[PDB]
């Protein structure tokens, strides 16, 4: 269980480096290391992740 | 937001699927059989020029049916020749933008999986007056091929393949509804894809000549 | 009657599971017999019958 | 305007079988004379119903 | 400056027009001249417009 | 660090270059040098800056 | 509700935004290549085999520099019939268990997706022992090329081509490191991306007997 300020910068983060992730996959361009492919890959595992663990603590 | 979560995860998810979706493999095969079509369009039209040079050198020998058969095949030489050339300039635009990498000798095909170059050829549920020419020269082929080459039993097989190659009519999808003939073939391809099927158009123009030559001698 | 535990778990494992096979369809790295398609399919599929069953209840 | 019932109920099935006709038409799996593009238009047509007739009452 | 009755008649009529002129674009049938994509043009367009003359209001 | 004031407007900036992208690519133009792929790598791109700048308020 | 109106639209837009991505064709491009390709074939067989007759009779009638390159000729002839034919039995192995439609005649190119019918070829980064005996294969037919065809001035030409097409060393990848050479273009593909290929080389072989027919007519 994390924190729910947590939760939310992780997934507006995600969703925004996995946006960028996919301009980078449309367009090839890719500054260094990043290569786009990667960076949409670590996008979309880290949200994931996101809405892994956030199934388990049923509060509300 | 109880469900409303899922719905923006479902924007996510197809804006991110927005991107490419052919793969790292199968645009290398549109790659590799653009070569391929190439060479083989290459080694066509340089021995078409010996089939040709041996039909009217035939023809300045005796005249006669050999003579309309060296008329004929000038006539959809010239026409295949104009088609040629055009799709030629289609497939530099298809293939303008990307820089073909030295030494080796292939462009990458890595890189060219967006047909962002052919977006200009039509307004999305039909052509613009872009590519309306590219439908009327097409039409223009056939009907050129048809007029020229014309009430005749031994090239009606010629022509029906001309005319089953070419149906410039709508297709139907894998569902069975039907769509423009350049919207089907060429709307959001790999630009690699689109220079492989116009440079397959090539080989089947190169392949029309083949074997009308080949009907003219035969 | 899908239970308010379940409900749950299908309301993450699902988005988790459509996320990670939309990741395995942009990318094609498919480790062993999932090949990404069919991890797509299980997660559109239970996130339809998710999408459906969560309609029966008006509750304000 | 309609009930509240078919409301609900329309929007959840209408946003549910649109998904499973993107489902039907990523997969290539029709069983009978479905083939996804007629579910795909008639979750289309069901949520244009939905965005038509809700654009009457602004109630808070 | 609008009414905000009219920017909601006029977003739920706009989405009602280029969800079944999409419904047009995935399917291509056109009636008359309504040839779907001017139809989703008018409606994206129109869309567009209240999204630009709704980012002016700083209610809270 | 940000004001409430341009919130809004960022938001609803970017619904609008995002819809009007959209709208490019689904209708195929030809203004300027874009038709696409070029106003979508703006709008996406803007989009992204949004989901980033989208958990910095996380009051509940 | 701001970006909310805009997100609940534009999810369906997207919607129709991926099925016009996904519906379009892109892999069934193969089909018309693959039928041209295969076209092809069907005309080439036929002109090679008038080709063959017209060298044998030509070596019948005039023997001696005819009779050697129709010995030549009915040698490659032979390894080109059995590669050729290999070549199919590899091909019907890629297209194991695809039928066509009944009434188009036509295959389900939408379909033949995945190439998980020749997985027998590999075993994670090497191969299995059916891949090992077709890199043997076409091992085999290139060097019964080269020994068929001697070291004349007229053929080094093709000699030299059928190097270059039928080159069987690692080709480097994107990354750069090394890669084998049916992992690099058959692991992965499409069936119908491997009976295109599979084709192609068809094509390529009765190319090569082509080349070799009207040259050694002309020599």
């Given at each position: 269980?994390?924190?729910?300020?947590?939760?939310?910068?992780?997934?507006?983060?995600?969703?925004?480096?996995?946006?960028?992730?996919?301009?980078?996959?449309?367009?090839?361009?890719?500054?260094?290391?990043?290569?786009?492919?990667?960076?949409?890959?670590?996008?979309?595992?880290?949200?994931?992740?996101?809405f892994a663990l956030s199934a388990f603590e049923p509060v509300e | 937001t109880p469900r409303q979560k899922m719905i923006n995860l479902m924007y996510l998810v197809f804006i991110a699927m927005l991107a490419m979706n052919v793969s790292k493999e199968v645009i290398s095969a549109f790659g590799?059989?653009?070569?391929?079509?190439?060479?083989?369009?290459?080694?066509?039209?340089?021995?078409?020029?010996?089939?040709?040079?041996?039909?009217?050198?035939?023809?300045?020998?005796?005249?006669?049916?050999?003579?309309?058969?060296?008329?004929?095949?000038?006539?959809?030489?010239?026409?295949?020749?104009?088609?040629?050339?055009?799709?030629?300039?289609?497939?530099?635009?298809?293939?303008?933008?990307?820089?073909?990498?030295?030494?080796?000798?292939?462009?990458?095909?890595?890189?060219?999986?967006?047909?962002?170059?052919?977006?200009?050829?039509?307004?999305?549920?039909?052509?613009?007056?872009?590519?309306?020419?590219?439908?009327?020269?097409?039409?223009?082929?056939?009907?050129?091929?048809?007029?020229?080459?014309?009430?005749?039993?031994?090239?009606?097989?010629?022509?029906?393949?001309?005319?089953?190659?070419?149906?410039?009519?709508?297709?139907?999808?894998?569902?069975?509804?039907?769509?423009?003939?350049?919207?089907?073939?060429?709307?959001?391809?790999?630009?690699?894809?689109?220079?492989?099927?116009?440079?397959?158009?090539?080989?089947?123009?190169?392949?029309?000549?083949?074997?009308?030559?080949?009907?003219?001698?035969?």
């Amino acid at each position: 269980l994390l924190s729910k300020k947590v939760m939310n910068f992780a997934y507006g983060m995600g969703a925004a480096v996995v946006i960028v992730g996919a301009l980078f996959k449309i367009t090839h361009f890719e500054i260094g290391p990043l290569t786009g492919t990667v960076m949409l890959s670590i996008g979309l595992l880290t949200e994931a992740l996101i809405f892994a663990l956030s199934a388990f603590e049923p509060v509300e | 937001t109880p469900r409303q979560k899922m719905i923006n995860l479902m924007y996510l998810v197809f804006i991110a699927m927005l991107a490419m979706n052919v793969s790292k493999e199968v645009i290398s095969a549109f790659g590799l059989m653009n070569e391929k079509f190439e060479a083989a369009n290459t080694s066509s039209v340089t021995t078409n020029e010996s089939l040709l040079t041996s039909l009217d050198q035939k023809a300045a020998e005796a005249k006669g049916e050999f003579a309309k058969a060296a008329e004929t095949a000038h006539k959809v030489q010239a026409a295949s020749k104009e088609f040629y050339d055009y799709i030629g300039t289609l497939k530099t635009q298809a293939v303008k933008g990307f820089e073909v990498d030295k030494e080796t000798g292939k462009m990458p095909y890595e890189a060219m999986d967006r047909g962002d170059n052919i977006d200009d050829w039509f307004t999305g549920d039909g052509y613009t007056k872009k590519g309306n020419e590219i439908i009327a020269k097409i039409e223009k082929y056939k009907s050129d091929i048809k007029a020229a080459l014309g009430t005749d039993k031994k090239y009606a097989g010629i022509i029906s393949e001309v005319e089953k190659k070419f149906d410039v009519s709508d297709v139907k999808n894998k569902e069975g509804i039907k769509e423009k003939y350049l919207a089907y073939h060429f709307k959001g391809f790999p630009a690699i894809a689109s220079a492989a099927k116009l440079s397959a158009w090539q080989n089947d123009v190169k392949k029309t000549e083949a074997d009308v030559y080949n009907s003219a001698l035969g």
